[PDB]
Structure formats: structure tokens, C-alpha cells
Design a binder for this molecule. Sequence first.
Ligand SMILES: Cc1cc2nc3c(=O)[nH]c(=O)nc-3n(C[C@@H](O)[C@H](O)[C@@H](O)COP(=O)(O)O)c2cc1C
Ligand SMILES: Cc1cc2nc3c(=O)[nH]c(=O)nc-3n(C[C@@H](O)[C@H](O)[C@@H](O)COP(=O)(O)O)c2cc1C
Ligand SMILES: Cc1cc2nc3c(=O)[nH]c(=O)nc-3n(C[C@@H](O)[C@H](O)[C@@H](O)COP(=O)(O)O)c2cc1C
Ligand SMILES: Cc1cc2nc3c(=O)[nH]c(=O)nc-3n(C[C@@H](O)[C@H](O)[C@@H](O)COP(=O)(O)O)c2cc1C
Ligand SMILES: CCCCCC(CCCCC)Sc1[nH]nnc1C(=O)O
Ligand SMILES: CCCCCC(CCCCC)Sc1[nH]nnc1C(=O)O
Ligand SMILES: CCCCCC(CCCCC)Sc1[nH]nnc1C(=O)O
Ligand SMILES: CCCCCC(CCCCC)Sc1[nH]nnc1C(=O)O
Lengths: 350, 350, 350, 350
Amino acid sequence: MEITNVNEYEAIAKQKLPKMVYDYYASGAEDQWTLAENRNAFSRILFRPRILIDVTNIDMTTTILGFKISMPIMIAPTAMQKMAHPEGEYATARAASAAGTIMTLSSWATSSVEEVASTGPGIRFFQLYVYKDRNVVAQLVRRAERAGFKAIALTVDTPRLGRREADIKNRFVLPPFLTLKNFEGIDLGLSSYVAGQIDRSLSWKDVAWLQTITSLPILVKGVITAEDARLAVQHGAAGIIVSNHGARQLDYVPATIMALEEVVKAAQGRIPVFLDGGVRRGTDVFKALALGAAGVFIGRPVVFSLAAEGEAGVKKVLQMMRDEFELTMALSGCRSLKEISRSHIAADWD
Amino acid sequence: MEITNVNEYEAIAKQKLPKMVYDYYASGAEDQWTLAENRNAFSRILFRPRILIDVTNIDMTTTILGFKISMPIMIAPTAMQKMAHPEGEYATARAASAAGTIMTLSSWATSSVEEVASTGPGIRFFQLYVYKDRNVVAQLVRRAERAGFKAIALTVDTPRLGRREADIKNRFVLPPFLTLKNFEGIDLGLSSYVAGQIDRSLSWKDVAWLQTITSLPILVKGVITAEDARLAVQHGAAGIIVSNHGARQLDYVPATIMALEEVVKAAQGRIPVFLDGGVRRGTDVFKALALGAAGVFIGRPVVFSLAAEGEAGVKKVLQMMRDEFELTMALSGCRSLKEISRSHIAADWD
Amino acid sequence: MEITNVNEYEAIAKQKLPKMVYDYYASGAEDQWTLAENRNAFSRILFRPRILIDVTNIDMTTTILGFKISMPIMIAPTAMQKMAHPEGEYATARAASAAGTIMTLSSWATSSVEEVASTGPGIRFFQLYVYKDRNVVAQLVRRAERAGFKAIALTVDTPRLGRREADIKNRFVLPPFLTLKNFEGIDLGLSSYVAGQIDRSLSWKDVAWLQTITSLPILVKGVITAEDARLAVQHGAAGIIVSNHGARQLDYVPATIMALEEVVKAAQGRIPVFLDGGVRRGTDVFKALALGAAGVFIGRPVVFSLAAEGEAGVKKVLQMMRDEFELTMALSGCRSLKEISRSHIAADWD
Amino acid sequence: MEITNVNEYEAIAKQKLPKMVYDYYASGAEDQWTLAENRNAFSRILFRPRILIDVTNIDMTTTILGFKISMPIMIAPTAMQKMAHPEGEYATARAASAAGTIMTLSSWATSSVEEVASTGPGIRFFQLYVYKDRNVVAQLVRRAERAGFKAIALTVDTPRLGRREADIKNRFVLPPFLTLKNFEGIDLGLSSYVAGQIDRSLSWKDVAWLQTITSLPILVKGVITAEDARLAVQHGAAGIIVSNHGARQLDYVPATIMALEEVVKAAQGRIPVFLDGGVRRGTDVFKALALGAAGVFIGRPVVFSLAAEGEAGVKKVLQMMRDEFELTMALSGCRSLKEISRSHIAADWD
Ligand SMILES: Cc1cc2nc3c(=O)[nH]c(=O)nc-3n(C[C@@H](O)[C@H](O)[C@@H](O)COP(=O)(O)O)c2cc1C
Ligand SMILES: Cc1cc2nc3c(=O)[nH]c(=O)nc-3n(C[C@@H](O)[C@H](O)[C@@H](O)COP(=O)(O)O)c2cc1C
Ligand SMILES: Cc1cc2nc3c(=O)[nH]c(=O)nc-3n(C[C@@H](O)[C@H](O)[C@@H](O)COP(=O)(O)O)c2cc1C
Ligand SMILES: Cc1cc2nc3c(=O)[nH]c(=O)nc-3n(C[C@@H](O)[C@H](O)[C@@H](O)COP(=O)(O)O)c2cc1C
Ligand SMILES: CCCCCC(CCCCC)Sc1[nH]nnc1C(=O)O
Ligand SMILES: CCCCCC(CCCCC)Sc1[nH]nnc1C(=O)O
Ligand SMILES: CCCCCC(CCCCC)Sc1[nH]nnc1C(=O)O
Ligand SMILES: CCCCCC(CCCCC)Sc1[nH]nnc1C(=O)O
């Protein structure tokens, strides 16, 4: 017996976390169709491996926004990680740096940007929502810059929260001793106002506004149509992240893997297009990249592994994924990321 | 624990109603393929949401036949509602008016048009079948007009009853104290003659006949082919209701959501086209409207909620649906019904 | 509780017949894929009903080979019916005549042509295989003609028996007191030689040979490709029966309903094309006819009903089917068989 | 009760072999999608049988690389067969010769080429991997030639081992008394070095190298794209074996039956194209040949039958398959292999 794949962590997490906590991390929106589809869609893409190629040395390094990382597998911003393990964001922070990759911190983290920054050096991104109190947004950005965060990931798919029914039936509440640390300290319990601070009037001009208060590259997270992808480009986006929020917002939106190519083509190679949602295997990673993605982000796997084995769990998840990805490149006949091509894959919609 | 979706009422209704009553409301025709398909088909239509749009104020109001209602979700005519709850049609009547929407009364109701009318003011439609005794039909129409009913919904898909096997095995009978109140009073137990009064010789000329005894707009309920949709238009129909009778008539007829577009195109915008059957979620509502429907009607959800919590249940069903529909519009980037478009959706048959 | 559909007889038959007998009647070839598919394929064809049509009088009568019958539902030749009920072929014979339809007798019947003929008057067909001993074939034909059988149905899909594994595991044997009565009497235990009498050298010239020893119309049973359908026409076939032997021969042959249209088109209206296999509902009957079939034949339903209720069971099966077929015509808007059209149906392959 | 099909051996093997051994033989790569698909794909190809054809004598003999064999069903190289039964490769060797067919020996066999050769005369192929120690490869080839092996089957789909998770959880190890006999004797425990001897720098020039140390025909095993098929032809391959290694390498590669035609067309009839993976029925064999394959190879069925009944089991598997294949040819109207055609089949992708 031994953990051999990322998905097995979900079971352990489930068996140890309180229903409320597990359900919060595991649930999708309403009937959870897209949740299931995010995983199932990958099963509709097949390989066309090239044999008899010198695959002695496999290079998985890539350059994201000028930064060079070990692999094209980064960590997505989850939220309230300390509900999964006392160390929460700390464990995830150290694990990301050690793995040689990027970690995106959530504004709703149970640790502050500076708390995370102290763990050690590493390339980090900050996820944020343009709240009603623009002054609070300015403060958060300024605070992230000081902590040395390299970019801002603006999430544009939550003008209003999706209906994750399990949470409603459970009557979800943030446990007693946890706190949204990034909101502790600057000029404004914390769970209700921050939730009530969501500004639903946001439009493309607010994207411009963000650009006038920070020089950090802005990544739009939550684009799934070619129409918005073009607008994101026109409005100075540094990159686009094809995401359906882990299927927790609007159910019946396609699987990110299916929508990806449409977004990649819309971008016309002007800016990097990334993807998240459903990634659990190295084979998943190879397909996303063969379809045009510059890299991918993982969410749930982090919190599940964190609950099961803390930092070791997160390190284990990152190692398994890079190993699987390497072996996939090897068996496909690709020695570097640049060698992966659309012809190495075959989609059910081809 | 708490009710978070319309479908959950069916379980409660089932656990409390007598087999005979539940089966009568729940069953489809014969092998019940279309019953299952009415729900499953919606799962084959996906969204293409627009992000970064000011979705501060969402307008769900619409004008149906000159009447302005709160939402495009109306109640379909069921039958013998008092089998589900002592108040039956009364509870449904008050709930519809309070919700600010239209309620279609069935000729086989366990309450009379005037009984319903007394609950309070509200826009109501009357469902009827051209019986052999045309004189009884005239009386019913005249009686509905006095009660202030705004339109007549003529059902044309039941020349003969479908075979709902559960009813046959159960030997379905109307409970002792209930009565088809609309037939009580005018010139003609009630379950057998009214069932034997079905006129199967009806053709388009009888539609004309109805038009010579009433000035109320006539809605044809039960059209699912483009051929009949055109005829309905030619024969002065005020609107068409794409319906397969909740899959209780001819099994193997397509899901209303699949047939809808064909009917919408046939109508050429000359008259409103509505839909019913399988609607259980706000996402269902958005798809029907994105496909051309002017509004939708719900059947079973009413009787199930009625059995579970009487009027409160019906109010709960209507609130949940409008809430879900609103959040869907918000996440899709639509501020009014006029903003919903075919491009906001993606069908498996595209 | 009450029997409401043909398929329910299989359960009763199963619960009362010995494993060996049930398995013999119920099994398909090897992995039984086509068995399942014969039924499932019908689920891939939908209706396009016409409403508001005078459906007061429905005419199901048809003329098959000059003979006028009550409905386009005939009985297929099964075998050793007395294993299902003491009366076997007798009950089936009386039931067919009473129902006003045709019954095809198998050469392997546990009753002789003359035994069946004595039950009463009725239009009957005789199924036969060109055995090695052509003299035995001549005798069988002559014997059928005397008994007043109207046509010969030559089965061309069994040059060698398919592998019905259940029979092998069960070590199937004909019960002690039963006998292949048609072979008793003329010039040649009976189970082994008759099985060993199968001539696998048969080709189109042998079809011609049959035509020189009888003037009765010859129906080829077991044609499923357009290539053979044309040959059947060229070689004086009186009609073609699209059949896959109830999926008991070569597994992975398409469902008869799927292959039908190809055969109908090949025939070019020169001769009637019939179908069998999987027919269990009136909706099944309407689809087969809408696709071009002149009528259909049923197999297993006869033996299952026979085991459950003897003749009454068979009468019940025939009544249920005509009732279901009538109601389907009524709901589709078809007053006669001639009114059924391809446009009243919609196939998944359209 | 009695064994009626090849697949039933897996159950017996499972119920008697130790988890570790069964899992090693039965498992696929990671989530085992292609494992399931290798079998399921055959279900998507249907027959178009020709009736009324003289199928008295069926000829299944074929000429592979100049050698004439009884049937187009050969044995694929498995590995460590003695884990399944004390006799291992011996039983398989005698069974293959008796069946009148070819057996491919694995370099990792628990019996040596000469040990196998002593069982008796028979046409045999040797499977091999170009190890780092080219000198060991030369020795193996020379050793095979002496034992009278007719050809070398070079496997090109394992530059690195796939992740068969069950083995990892089980901590698979070669039982105490077994030995990789081909490595015992010549100039180089055995499980770890031989596994560490895999050369992952192999490319097409190494294929040429093999051709300069042996005159035996070289068969490339593991080609699944048309691109590699052409290269295999250009580089003097004697034949191509479309294989996905029994789905144990890279998951999400298509089923061999689906990829086959692409490879057949690429070869342009210049060299024979074979197939393996998922073959379990004679119907499977007919489809592979109708698609262009010159013959097929079976893997798992050998080890499962071996575990259940030793040599008798293997003889039983080979007999069942030829019987099933014969009956399929008979029912399709094919008297010889040359008579099987693409028109006798119908693929879901046609
Ligand atoms: C428990 C949880 C919390 C999340 N929190 C955020 C968040 O703080 N910010 C954000 O933009 N997205 C959030 N997401 C979603 C993204 O981080 C991301 O798209 C991700 O969940 C990707 O899909 P995966 O979980 O299938 O890997 C959250 C997802 C989960 C499951
Ligand atoms: C118990 C029950 C009674 C019905 N009674 C009527 C009726 O009186 N008149 C009519 O035209 N349709 C009747 N229908 C069907 C329609 O009201 C309507 O098409 C509806 O059931 C829509 O589908 P849904 O139940 O899936 O929402 C009935 C349906 C049910 C389940
Ligand atoms: C038990 C049994 C016996 C059969 N016997 C014969 C027979 O004697 N002659 C023949 O041509 N076909 C025979 N068939 C098949 C046909 O009668 C016929 O194609 C039929 O089974 C149609 O399919 P169904 O069973 O799905 O209705 C037999 C089928 C069964 C199940
Ligand atoms: C237990 C086992 C051992 C295998 N050993 C080898 C081997 O030694 N050499 C090789 O090239 N392929 C090996 N394969 C795979 C091939 O022999 C072959 O492609 C085969 O398994 C075909 O598929 P099937 O098992 O579905 O019939 C092995 C497969 C199994 C299941
Ligand atoms: C300003 C937007 C508010 C969202 C923040 C939280 C969602 C609701 C918290 C529990 C009720 S946690 C989170 N952040 N972003 N998405 C989520 C997620 O849980 O899916
Ligand atoms: C004049 C037509 C007669 C139909 C009225 C009833 C159907 C049968 C009543 C129980 C046997 S109730 C009803 N009304 N319309 N459809 C139904 C339905 O139950 O599906
Ligand atoms: C001359 C051909 C021999 C077939 C006759 C019988 C089949 C085998 C009898 C039980 C072993 S009964 C029968 N007749 N035709 N098909 C069948 C069937 O059982 O599918
Ligand atoms: C030089 C390549 C090494 C592969 C040989 C073995 C695979 C691993 C042995 C158990 C850990 S047995 C084998 N040989 N080829 N494929 C396999 C298989 O088991 O799938």
C-alpha cells in the first residue's frame, strides 16, 4: 500500500476532515455537472506518441513572465488553507519554493502576504478581486509588492457567488481561530464584510484602473470564450487563465480543457494562456500544453494533500505530477516543452 | 439540512403521498424514455458566459400577451391538486399571484374557476379540451371569462390518453371527497364521463370554432413539429406551447428543449413560443429563453412542493427558481431578458 | 398489479421454467451484444407526431401476399414450443387465428403441420431449411401444402449454429416426451440427425431448386445487407425478412431496425420487406413500418407468454401489441397504415 | 458448467494466483483507460455477413514471413511465465507447436531459448530490447539463431517503464526460485540490472545496427502512428506490429483496433502489419484481418489459462479461438483469409 496518484489524497482528506470543511473544498456548483466534466473531458483526448527518439534527458523548465521555473505546474489560489492543516499557506509556500515553482496566494488566505514571504524566497503571484472599497484594493496591492509578489491575478468570474448547495445545507462558517490575515492590518466579522465587499459593477474599465495603481503584470482568471479573450488582450492583460473556477460558479460551462483551444486561438500568441480545473495527472498536463497552454495550475489537490500530510503531502503531490509529466514526455518522444505539439495529441472533436 | 433545489421536493412528496397519488403525478408514458430525456437533454447544452459586465441590477420582468409579470416562469395546468394537499389549487393560486406570475388552471381541477378567482387578483389562464358536448365547452369558456381569466390554453396532444402503466397496475381512482368542480354547476361519476367526453375527431376547424365563441387569445399546447407550428400560426393561434405533456402521452417524442428551436423558427416571430417539461433549474430557464422561448411553464414541481409544504412549498419553488435564474443571468452577463442570446449558449447539436 | 407490457412475461417465464429451457429461449450468441442492441436500437428513433387530426377510426388491416390480416404483427417461427407449455404450438396456433393474423411454423416444432392445421382455419407459413437429404425437404414441402400452408419461409442465416454459451454450459437436451413431429412420419435421436442434416453448401442455385418443387411464395429469412437483398430479388424471392435470428447466430451484426432501411432501398419496392428481432412495443411496430417494413414478426414474446399463461398469454401478448400500435398511430395522426411515413419518424442517424 | 470463452480464464487465474502475480499480469497503466478501451473498441465494429455461400470448407492457413501456419492467431511475448505455472514457457511452447502456430519468446522468460527449443520443433520468434550493453544484445541474438528462432521482434515502446500502480502498491518482486534464464550464461539480481540496462537513447540508427549483427527479419513492435509506420518501412523493417503494449505503457493511447487502419495504409502493402491487445474472440480476429492485419497476437490469455490449467489451458485457449474464428468466417461467407474484406465489416467511424 502506498499513495501512487494525486486523486487518492481526496479520499484521505475526506476521511479525516469535518464534513463542512471537506464539502467546502470538494463541492461544485449546484448539480455539479461541470465538476465531473472537468475530469472526464481529459478522457476524450488521446495520444499519438513518437517512438525511437533519444529521450535520455527531458527538459521541463519553462519561462513564465520572465521567471524561469522547474516545471509548467503551478499552484492555484485556494482559500482558508489553515482549515486543512494548522500550517496551511505556510506548508504550501515552502513546498512550492522547494518544488521550484510558482504559488498564487489568495486574498482570503488564513496567512498574510508577508507571513508567506518569510517562509523563504520564491516566485509568487497574488490573487485579488476589485472590491467596492477601491482603497482596500490599493492597500492589498501595495502590501503584495512589498512582500515581493511578482504578479496580480485578477479573478473575473465571481461577480456573485455560485450556489454550492452542500455549504448551504451545512451552514458553512469559518472556524473560531482562523482569520483572513491580509485584511487584518490595513484600513477597512471578516468573513461577512469581505463577502459583502464584492463589487458586481466591474467592467473592462476597472481593469484599466488596476493598471494605474500597480505596474505588476495583470493575469485575468476566469476567461472561457474567444470574445472575452480578445478583450483581455486589448485591455493590456499580461496573460489569460482559462478557468471555470473549479466548477464552483456557473454550472454547465464547458470543461476548461475543451474551451482552451478557442481561447488560445483568440489570443493569437500575443500573451500566454494558462489553464486550471481538473488537472490531476501528468497526462493531463501534456494535453493542456499540446493544446496551446503555457502552463497549468492546480487547486483542490493542494488542500487535500495538505489535510492528509501537511507540507509532505503537498511536496508529494508536486513530485508525483512532475514525474508523471516527465514519463509522458518521454513516452511521447518530447525532450523539451518546445517539442510538444498539437500532432502529438488527438481530440474527440477533431 | 435544508431544501436547496426544486427536485428535492419529489423525494418528500414520494415519502408522504400514497403510492397511487405519487405514481399518478410522477409517471411518464410506458417505458418512460422521454420522461428521463426531458431532464437529461438540458445537460447537453452549455454556457458561453460573458465576464466583466455590470450586473448590478438584473431585470427578469417580461410582457406575456400584454400582461407584465415578475419573471418568465409560469405555472402549467396540472390536475386534481387537492390530492396533494387539502388546499390544492387555492395554495397554488395564492402562491402564483404573490410570486407575481401567471397560473394556468386545469379544467379537471378540484376547485372551480370562481373558487380560484376569490383567492385574490392575479393573471390566470384556463386550460381546456374541446369535448364532444360543445355546449359544455361553451359553458366552461363563459364561466372562465366571468372569473376574469385572461386566456384559453387549448391542449391538442391528448386525442386519446397515453398508457401510464403505474396507474393501470395501481387501478387509479379519484379519492372520495374530491370533485372536478368546474363540471359541477353547469349542464352536462365526474371522472368517468369527462374522460369519456374526449372528442378524438378534433382538427384545425375546431380551433376556428373555439375562436367564434370566445375573444380570448387561444394558446395551442402540445405542438412539437415545425409543420404544426405553421398551421397553428395560420389558424389564428395567439401563441404556441412546445410541450410533450410531461412525457405522459406518446413515448419517444423528443425532449421539449430539443424540439423548441424547430418550432421557434417555424413561428417566424409572428407569435410567442413557450415551453414546458423538465424545467427544474434557473439554468434550464436561461437555456429555453436563449433558444427562443418567451417563457416557460412548470408542472410536477408544483404538486410535489404542494404535498410537502402546501402553499409555502409552492412559494419556495417559485423563489428558488427565480433566484437561480437571476444568478444565471448575472454570471452570463445579461442584465435583462432582451440581453439573452443564442450566442450565450452552445448546444451539443451545434 | 397486472401485466401491462409484453416484456414482463420474460420475468414470469424465467421464474417458472427450468434454467435450461429459459436459457435456451432467452440467450443470444456469445457475448450477446446484438441481443441487447436489438432492443436498444429502437430507443434511437424518435417520433414527429401530427396533432389535430381526426383519429376516430384507426385501420390496421394490411394485405400480405394477397392475404388480408387484422394487423401488421405476425408470429415468427420459434422451436420446440411444447417445452414452454404442454399445448405449445396448439395454443399459439389458436391464438394467432383468433387474433386474425399469420403464424409461421418451424420445421423443428413439437407438433406437426397437420396437428396445427386441425386447430382451426388460419393463414399460416412454414419455415424450413434445405437439408442434405433434399428428399426430406420435398416431403416437408408437400406435407405443408396439404395442410394448407400459404408460403415457405426459407431461413438462410444458419449454415452453422451460433455459439449460445449458456446452452453449452447447461448441456441442453430435448426433454423425454417431446418430438420433432414434422420429421415423424416421412422417410428419413431426431435432435441429433436433423441437427446433423444441416447443409452448409447452400447457395443461390438451391433457392432456384426449391422453386422447382413448390409453387408457394418463398420468403428469404436472414438478409441484412443490400447486396444480398438484390440477389434475393433477382432469384425470385417473394419477400425478404430482415432478421439476425434474434441475435443467436453471429454476434456484432447490427440491430435489425438499423439495417432495415438499407434492405428496403435495395428491394426498390419490387417485393415486401419484413423485420423481426427486438419488437416488444407498438412504438417498435410504428418505427419499423415508418422505415419501410410491410409488417413485423415476434419470437421470444410468444414462448415467454406461453410458459406463463399458455394460450391466454399469447392472446394477451397479441392484444397488448395491437392496442399499443393503435394508440401510437392515433397519437401520430395516422388513420391507416398507408398514412405512416418516414417524416413521422426521426432517426439518430439522420 | 464448462469454459466456453477465453475471458473466463482471467477469473480462475485471479482466484488462484497471489494478488501480486495476478495484478502484475492483469494491470494496465495508471488509470487503465486504454486497458478497458482495448476490449471495448471491438464492440464499435459491426459485421455485414454474406448469406447463401458454400461454406463447407474453411481455410484459415496463412503464410507469415514465408512460414505457413494453421491460423492467423499467434502468441505474444509475455514474461516470467513460470510465475503462472511451474512449466511456464515449456507448456506454452508445446501448446503453440501443437496448435500449428508461432510463439514469440520474451528475453525476460523464466526459461531459455534453448530450453524452449528442446520441447520440440516449431516456428518461433524472439522478442528483445536493445540494451545499453550492445554486447549482451549480440550474444542474445546469436543464441536465438542457434536455437533456430526465425525472427527478431524488436519492442520500441518501452524507453522507460509505464506506471502500473498496482505493482507499486504491491511492491512486486520476482519469486525466489525463478530466473531470467536467457541472461544466465553469457557475459554480462537479474531483475534489477536487466531493468537498469534499458537504453533510452535508442533511435532509428540503432535499428540499422541490429540489422548489421543479424540477418533475421526484424519486426518492430509498438508502432501506432502512420508517421512511425513509414519510418519503420524506410529502415528495413520486415513487418510492423501495431501494439500499445497491452495498455501498460502510456495511458490514453488509442485501442490498437482503432489505430490499425492508419498503420496499414501507411505501410502501403510493402510489409505485413500485425496487431495485438484486447484480442479475446474469433470475432475480434475477423475484424482485425478485415481491417488489413496479416495476423494477430495474444498475451494475457496465455498466462491466465496457464495458471488455471497449465498446457491444457493454453491448448484450450488456442482451440476456442480458432473455432470461434472459423465459425465467424463461415457465417460471414468467407472460405479463406483472402476472402475477408473491408466490406464485410462496418466501423463506427465509417
Ligand atoms: C476550496 C477552493 C477555494 C478556492 N478559492 C479560490 C480563491 O481564493 N480565488 C480564486 O480566484 N479561485 C479560487 N478557487 C478556484 C481556483 O483556485 C482554481 O480555479 C482551482 O480550484 C482549479 O481547479 P481544481 O481544483 O480542479 O484544480 C477555489 C477553489 C477551491 C476548491
Ligand atoms: C399530474 C399531472 C397532471 C397534468 N394535468 C394536465 C392537465 O390538466 N392539462 C394539460 O394540458 N396538461 C397536463 N399535464 C401536463 C402539463 O401540465 C405540463 O405539460 C407539465 O406537466 C410540464 O412538465 P413538467 O411536469 O416536467 O414540468 C399534467 C402533468 C402532470 C404531471
Ligand atoms: C427459442 C427460439 C427458437 C428459434 N427458432 C427458430 C426457428 O425454428 N426457425 C427460424 O428460422 N428462426 C428461429 N428463431 C429466431 C426467429 O424465429 C426470429 O428471428 C425471432 O426470434 C425474432 O426475434 P425476437 O425473439 O427478438 O422477437 C428462434 C428464436 C428463438 C428465441
Ligand atoms: C504480463 C505481461 C508481460 C508482458 N511482457 C512483454 C514482454 O516481455 N515483451 C514485450 O514486448 N511485450 C510484453 N507485454 C505485452 C505484449 O506481449 C503484448 O503486446 C500483449 O500483452 C497483447 O495484449 P493482450 O494482453 O491484450 O493480449 C506483456 C504483457 C503482459 C500482460
Ligand atoms: C470576494 C469573493 C468572495 C469569495 C471568497 C470565498 C467564497 C465564499 C466563502 C465561504 C462561504 S473563498 C473563494 N475565493 N474565491 N473563490 C472562492 C471559492 O470558495 O470558490
Ligand atoms: C379530457 C382529457 C382527460 C385527461 C384528464 C386526466 C387524465 C386521466 C385521469 C386519471 C385516470 S388528468 C390530466 N389532464 N390532462 N392531462 C392529464 C394527465 O394526468 O396527464
Ligand atoms: C437445421 C438447423 C438447426 C437449428 C434448430 C434448433 C437449434 C439447436 C437446437 C438445440 C441445441 S432450434 C432453431 N431453429 N432455428 N433456429 C433455432 C434456434 O434455437 O435459434
Ligand atoms: C528492458 C525492459 C524491462 C521490461 C521487462 C519487465 C517489466 C518490469 C518487471 C517487473 C517490475 S516484464 C515485460 N517485458 N516487456 N514488457 C513487460 C511488461 O511487464 O509489461
